[PDB]
Design a protein around this ligand. Sequence first.
Ligand SMILES: *C(=N)[C@@H](NC(=O)[C@@H]1[C@@H]2[C@H](CN1C(=O)[C@@H](NC(=O)C(F)(F)F)C(C)(C)C)C2(C)C)c1cncc(F)c1
Ligand SMILES: *C(=N)[C@@H](NC(=O)[C@@H]1[C@@H]2[C@H](CN1C(=O)[C@@H](NC(=O)C(F)(F)F)C(C)(C)C)C2(C)C)c1cncc(F)c1
Lengths: 306, 306
Amino acid sequence: SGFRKMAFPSGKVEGCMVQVTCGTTTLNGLWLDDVVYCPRHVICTSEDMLNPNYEDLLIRKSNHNFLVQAGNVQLRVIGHSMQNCVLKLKVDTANPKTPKYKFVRIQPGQTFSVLACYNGSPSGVYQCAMRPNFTIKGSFLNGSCGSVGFNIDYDCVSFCYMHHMELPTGVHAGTDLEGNFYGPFVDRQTAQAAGTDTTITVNVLAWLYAAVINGDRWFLNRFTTTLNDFNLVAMKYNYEPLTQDHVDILGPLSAQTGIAVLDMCASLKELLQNGMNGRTILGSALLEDEFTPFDVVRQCSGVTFQ
Amino acid sequence: SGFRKMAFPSGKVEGCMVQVTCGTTTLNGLWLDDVVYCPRHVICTSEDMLNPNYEDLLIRKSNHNFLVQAGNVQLRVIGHSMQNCVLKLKVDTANPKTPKYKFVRIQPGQTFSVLACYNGSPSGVYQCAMRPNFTIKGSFLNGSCGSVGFNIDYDCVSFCYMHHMELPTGVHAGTDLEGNFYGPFVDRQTAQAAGTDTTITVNVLAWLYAAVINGDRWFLNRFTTTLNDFNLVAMKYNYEPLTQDHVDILGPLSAQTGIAVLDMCASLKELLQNGMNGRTILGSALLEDEFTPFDVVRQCSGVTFQ
Ligand SMILES: *C(=N)[C@@H](NC(=O)[C@@H]1[C@@H]2[C@H](CN1C(=O)[C@@H](NC(=O)C(F)(F)F)C(C)(C)C)C2(C)C)c1cncc(F)c1
Ligand SMILES: *C(=N)[C@@H](NC(=O)[C@@H]1[C@@H]2[C@H](CN1C(=O)[C@@H](NC(=O)C(F)(F)F)C(C)(C)C)C2(C)C)c1cncc(F)c1
C-alpha cells in the first residue's frame, strides 16, 4: 500500500543524456542511435532570442559549432538539421545505450517522468502531468533545457517531452521529440504566458480511487449523481468535463473498489462544494489531479519494466 | 523554478536489482560486487514468520535453495550468510554494473530515493523521508521487499534502506544495508505498529524557503520569534524541536532569501496557529516536511550526479 508520485526508473534515459554546447550556450541533448536531439534555441544568442530566424541562424552554423559531450567523451557532429523546434545533430557514434524507444506526443492530462538534467548530467527524476493548458509544473533551473519527459512500457521508452523554456508563472513549456510545442508557445522571447488551466477531473477521480484502495474512505457517501449533474458542478469549479470515456476508463478502479464511478463523482462533488474540513486524502489537503487511472492501477496493482 | 518531490536518477541502482527466490517466496535483492543482499525473511514460510528462529531456519538452507535472477540470467549462489536482518548471498559473478557505493544509515528526517522493485525488475522511483518514528511512507506492494532506498552524491550511491515489511497503518519498515532495522521493528509477524510520529520542523522550514525562492511569499511577515518561543509552539503542534544546529543548517537558505531563520519560524508559527486560510504553498495545502534543507538547496541551485 501507499501512494507516491512515482516516476519511471530513469536509467534507460540517463544513458541517452548528453551535453550540447553551441557558442556559450550549454544545454542537454538526447542521444539516440547516431542523432542528438536538443532544443534548437541552443544556436541562439541572447539577442537572437528576441526575434530569431532559426533557418537563418542555422544556415550560419557548421557541424564544428556543436560540441556534444557524452559524459567525459566528446561526440563528433557530422551533420545538423532542424526539425521544427528541435535540432537533430547527426554524430559519428550510435549511442550503445540506446533503449528501445518511441517518440509519442501525449495529451493534456497524461503523466510522464522527467529526468531533469544539467550539462548532460541527470540531476533528478520526478513525475509530471501535461496540464490542460499544455504547460507542465516542472522543476527546472537554468541549463535544464533539453531534459526529456518519458514513459516506459515494459522495455520501450516513449519520449514525449523535451524542455524548452520557463514561462513567467514558473511553469514550463516544451515540445514533443519531433520538435512541436505542446500548446501555443514559441521558442522566442515574447510575453507569452500559460493561460487558463483546469483541473484534470478524471485524474482526481482516479486518485480518489487510489485513496479508497489505500483505506481513505471518509469522503465516500451513499449519494450518487448523474454525469450531467456532476459536469455542471465540474464546470463551476474549473474542472474539466468528465466524459463517458473517462467513466469507462475508471471502470477497473470502480470494479476493484466497488464504488460506482458516478458515486465517486458524487463524492468529488461534495469535496468541491464542502472542501475537506481539515481532513486529508493520501496525505494531501488538496484534490490531486496528476495521477491518471493508469498510474493508479500501476501503483495499486504492481507493474514493472525491463 | 518549480519544486517537485524529486528522486535521484535511479539507473545506477537499477543495475543492481536482482530477483531472489527461496522456496515459494520471491523478492528483490541488491547485487553489488559478488554479493546479493536481500531481506532474510526470504527464507521464511508463512508459518515460519509467526516466530522464526532465523539461525535455525538458515542452517537448514543450502546455496542451491537460493535462486538469484539477474534479469534473464541466473546467478549461481556459492555462499550464504546472515548479517542481522539481511541475507548475504555470495554469487559467482561480480555485478559488472556495481556503482561506487556506500552503506550509510540515515537519520529520521533525512530523505532518500526508493527504487520500488518487483521480481528484481524496477517499477518506479520516488522520494521518501525517514519519519521521526523510523517508518517511511512508501509505496510498496507484495513482492517489493528488498527494494532499496538510496542517495547519490556525485557518482557514489549511498544505500540507506532496504524494504522489509508494511506495518498495519500502511507505512513501511526496513533496515539499513547492514540489516539493522530502522526503529523498533522486527522481521516477524507481531502486532507491531508505527507508534507516534512528529513533523520534521527543520524540513518544513526548508520547504518554506523553497516556497519563497519560488515566489510564494504570502505566509511571510515582519514578525519574528525566539527559538524557545517557537519550540513552545512546535511542541504543541507535534512538531519536533528546532535546534540551533537546524537554524545553522538553514543559514544558506536564509541568506539566499534574506529571511532570517527565526522570521521563518514566526511564519511557521502563524501557519500552525492560523492554518493557511484556503491558500497553498508550492502546490500544497499542507505543511510539507519531506524536503531537507539539502534537498531544497539542491533543487533551488542545481547539482547533478555522474
Ligand atoms: C534552459 N536551459 C532555460 N530556458 C531557456 O533558455 C529558455 C529558452 C529561451 C529563453 N528561455 C526561457 O525559459 C525564458 N522564458 C521565456 O522567454 C518565456 F517566458 F517562456 F517566454 C526565461 C529563462 C527568461 C524564463 C527560450 C524561450 C527558447 C531554463 C529552462 N527552465 C527553467 C529555467 F530556469 C531556465
Ligand atoms: C514484501 N515482499 C512484503 N512484505 C513482507 O512479506 C513482510 C515481511 C514478513 C511479512 N511482511 C509484511 O509486510 C506484513 N507485515 C507485518 O507482519 C507487520 F505488520 F509489519 F508486522 C504484511 C504484508 C502482512 C502487512 C515480514 C514482516 C518480515 C510487502 C512489503 N510491503 C508492502 C506489501 F504490501 C508487502
